[PDB]
Design an enzyme around this catalytic site. Sequence first.
Site, PDB file in Angstrom:
ATOM      1  N   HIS A  40       0.782  -1.166  -0.124  1.00 10.62           N
ATOM      2  CA  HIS A  40      -0.104  -0.026  -0.016  1.00 10.62           C
ATOM      3  C   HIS A  40       0.916   1.422   0.019  1.00 10.62           C
ATOM      4  O   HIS A  40       0.265   2.415  -0.241  1.00 10.62           O
ATOM      5  CB  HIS A  40      -1.022  -0.076   1.137  1.00 10.62           C
ATOM      6  CG  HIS A  40      -0.476   0.419   2.542  1.00 10.62           C
ATOM      7  ND1 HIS A  40       0.067  -0.622   3.412  1.00 10.62           N
ATOM      8  CD2 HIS A  40      -0.442   1.401   3.060  1.00 10.62           C
ATOM      9  CE1 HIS A  40       0.277   0.084   4.344  1.00 10.62           C
ATOM     10  NE2 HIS A  40       0.300   1.384   4.164  1.00 10.62           N
ATOM     11  N   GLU A  71       0.608  -8.023   1.180  1.00 13.61           N
ATOM     12  CA  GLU A  71       0.926  -6.526   1.693  1.00 13.61           C
ATOM     13  C   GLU A  71       2.659  -6.547   1.780  1.00 13.61           C
ATOM     14  O   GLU A  71       2.950  -5.603   2.346  1.00 13.61           O
ATOM     15  CB  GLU A  71       0.132  -6.375   2.768  1.00 13.61           C
ATOM     16  CG  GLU A  71      -1.172  -5.395   2.539  1.00 13.61           C
ATOM     17  CD  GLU A  71      -0.872  -3.963   1.611  1.00 13.61           C
ATOM     18  OE1 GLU A  71       0.065  -3.289   2.108  1.00 13.61           O
ATOM     19  OE2 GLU A  71      -1.293  -4.114   0.655  1.00 13.61           O
ATOM     20  N   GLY A 145       1.213   6.150  10.830  1.00  5.40           N
ATOM     21  CA  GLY A 145       2.658   6.221  10.633  1.00  5.40           C
ATOM     22  C   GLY A 145       3.537   5.102  11.137  1.00  5.40           C
ATOM     23  O   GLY A 145       4.851   4.984  11.162  1.00  5.40           O
ATOM     24  N   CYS A 147       3.344   1.868   9.889  1.00 11.51           N
ATOM     25  CA  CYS A 147       3.696   0.769   8.685  1.00 11.51           C
ATOM     26  C   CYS A 147       4.965   0.716   8.281  1.00 11.51           C
ATOM     27  O   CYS A 147       5.621   1.928   8.159  1.00 11.51           O
ATOM     28  CB  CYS A 147       2.846   1.105   7.692  1.00 11.51           C
ATOM     29  SG  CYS A 147       0.956   0.834   8.091  1.00 11.51           S
TER      30      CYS A 147
HETATM   31  C1  HOV Z   1       0.039   2.520   8.466  1.00 12.44           C
HETATM   32  C2  HOV Z   1       0.238   3.423   7.211  1.00 12.44           C
HETATM   33  C3  HOV Z   1       1.276   4.347   7.303  1.00 12.44           C
HETATM   34  O1  HOV Z   1       2.034   4.299   8.464  1.00 12.44           O
HETATM   35  O2  HOV Z   1       1.366   5.068   6.366  1.00 12.44           O
HETATM   36  C4  HOV Z   1       2.446   6.131   6.435  1.00 12.44           C
HETATM   37  C5  HOV Z   1       2.065   7.369   5.458  1.00 12.44           C
HETATM   38  C6  HOV Z   1      -1.450   2.263   8.912  1.00 12.44           C
HETATM   39  C7  HOV Z   1      -1.406   1.765  10.239  1.00 12.44           C
HETATM   40  C8  HOV Z   1      -2.701   1.761  11.089  1.00 12.44           C
HETATM   41  C9  HOV Z   1      -3.354   3.151  11.175  1.00 12.44           C
HETATM   42  C10 HOV Z   1      -4.186   2.906  12.321  1.00 12.44           C
HETATM   43  N1  HOV Z   1      -3.638   1.996  13.134  1.00 12.44           N
HETATM   44  C11 HOV Z   1      -2.712   1.259  12.411  1.00 12.44           C
HETATM   45  O3  HOV Z   1      -1.900   0.380  12.804  1.00 12.44           O
HETATM   46  N2  HOV Z   1      -2.205   1.330   7.737  1.00 12.44           N
HETATM   47  C12 HOV Z   1      -3.132   1.724   7.408  1.00 12.44           C
HETATM   48  O4  HOV Z   1      -3.997   2.832   7.683  1.00 12.44           O
HETATM   49  C13 HOV Z   1      -3.894   0.738   6.572  1.00 12.44           C
HETATM   50  C14 HOV Z   1      -3.962   1.065   5.056  1.00 12.44           C
HETATM   51  C15 HOV Z   1      -4.089  -0.043   4.042  1.00 12.44           C
HETATM   52  C16 HOV Z   1      -3.019  -1.138   4.072  1.00 12.44           C
HETATM   53  C17 HOV Z   1      -3.159  -2.164   3.397  1.00 12.44           C
HETATM   54  C18 HOV Z   1      -3.975  -2.551   2.504  1.00 12.44           C
HETATM   55  C19 HOV Z   1      -4.706  -1.441   2.157  1.00 12.44           C
HETATM   56  C20 HOV Z   1      -4.741  -0.211   3.051  1.00 12.44           C
HETATM   57  C21 HOV Z   1      -5.229   2.066   4.810  1.00 12.44           C
HETATM   58  C22 HOV Z   1      -6.139   1.269   5.795  1.00 12.44           C
HETATM   59  N3  HOV Z   1      -5.336   0.577   6.875  1.00 12.44           N
HETATM   60  C23 HOV Z   1      -5.891   0.372   8.202  1.00 12.44           C
HETATM   61  O5  HOV Z   1      -5.000   0.077   8.857  1.00 12.44           O
HETATM   62  C24 HOV Z   1      -7.410   0.428   8.403  1.00 12.44           C
HETATM   63  N4  HOV Z   1      -7.721  -0.646   9.076  1.00 12.44           N
HETATM   64  C25 HOV Z   1      -8.294  -1.733   8.547  1.00 12.44           C
HETATM   65  O6  HOV Z   1      -8.642  -1.783   7.518  1.00 12.44           O
HETATM   66  C26 HOV Z   1      -8.499  -2.792   9.349  1.00 12.44           C
HETATM   67  C27 HOV Z   1      -8.806  -4.096   9.219  1.00 12.44           C
HETATM   68  C28 HOV Z   1      -8.881  -4.784  10.343  1.00 12.44           C
HETATM   69  C29 HOV Z   1      -9.069  -6.081  10.779  1.00 12.44           C
HETATM   70  O7  HOV Z   1      -8.420  -4.336  11.240  1.00 12.44           O
HETATM   71  N5  HOV Z   1      -8.168  -2.736  10.872  1.00 12.44           N
HETATM   72  C30 HOV Z   1      -7.791   1.756   9.104  1.00 12.44           C
HETATM   73  C31 HOV Z   1      -9.045   1.908   9.284  1.00 12.44           C
HETATM   74  C32 HOV Z   1      -7.226   2.992   8.371  1.00 12.44           C
END
Ligand code: HOV
EC number: 3.4.22.29
Length: 180
Positions: A40, A71, A145, A147
């Site tokens: 992503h 991922e 932040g 990831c």
């Molecule tokens: C990391 C992204 C990052 O640091 O980017 C810097 C520019 C985040 C971590 C996340 C945010 C809230 N707590 C966390 O641990 N990742 C995301 O926001 C991911 C992202 C994504 C990743 C892979 C594929 C598609 C999209 C965007 C959505 N996402 C999420 O974590 C969502 N959560 C879920 O969909 C989810 C599903 C389940 C079972 O639990 N959470 C958030 C709603 C944003």
Amino acid sequence: GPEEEFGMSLIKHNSCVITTENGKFTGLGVYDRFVVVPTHADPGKEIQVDGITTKVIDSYDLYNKNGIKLEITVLKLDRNEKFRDIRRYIPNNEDDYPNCNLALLANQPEPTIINVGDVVSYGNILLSGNQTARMLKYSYPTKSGYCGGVLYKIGQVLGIHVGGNGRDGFSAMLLRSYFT
Ligand SMILES: *[C@@H](CC(=O)OCC)[C@H](C[C@@H]1CCNC1=O)NC(=O)[C@@H]1[C@@H](c2ccccc2)CCN1C(=O)[C@@H](NC(=O)c1cc(C)on1)C(C)C
């Protein structure tokens, strides 16, 4: 202790900040010019590695046998520097792991180690409605932040942080066969 020092050494020697058009991510250098990032992150023909514009020679988005995204994206970088080889710390199989940590670099004021607690092999989830496989789950309120953050224990590099919902956090599992 040694587990904390091992984590700080992974940051020092095997991590970098990767900037793409989607933001900044913690990048894990696996060996040679190969770095991993969450898919992503959507790395383009050029990325920044610790602020340095760097051409991506090859990029590989990893999928399981059923065509479901893991991922994990592997990038071969056009840079002189070579990463220390950390493949020997990466497990061969899926498993659960008590008391893990996340090593964070990108989006942090300084290198940070988070104790996320016990980790379980969790199967497939939907990340923003998209099926993602081989998840490692922890009950820790991970946030924006984080990831690319490196999931680890002493002598074990286990995954990279990809998502969370305010209660649980999730990493893409790192398996040795992805890199050998
Ligand atoms: C990391 C992204 C990052 O640091 O980017 C810097 C520019 C985040 C971590 C996340 C945010 C809230 N707590 C966390 O641990 N990742 C995301 O926001 C991911 C992202 C994504 C990743 C892979 C594929 C598609 C999209 C965007 C959505 N996402 C999420 O974590 C969502 N959560 C879920 O969909 C989810 C599903 C389940 C079972 O639990 N959470 C958030 C709603 C944003």
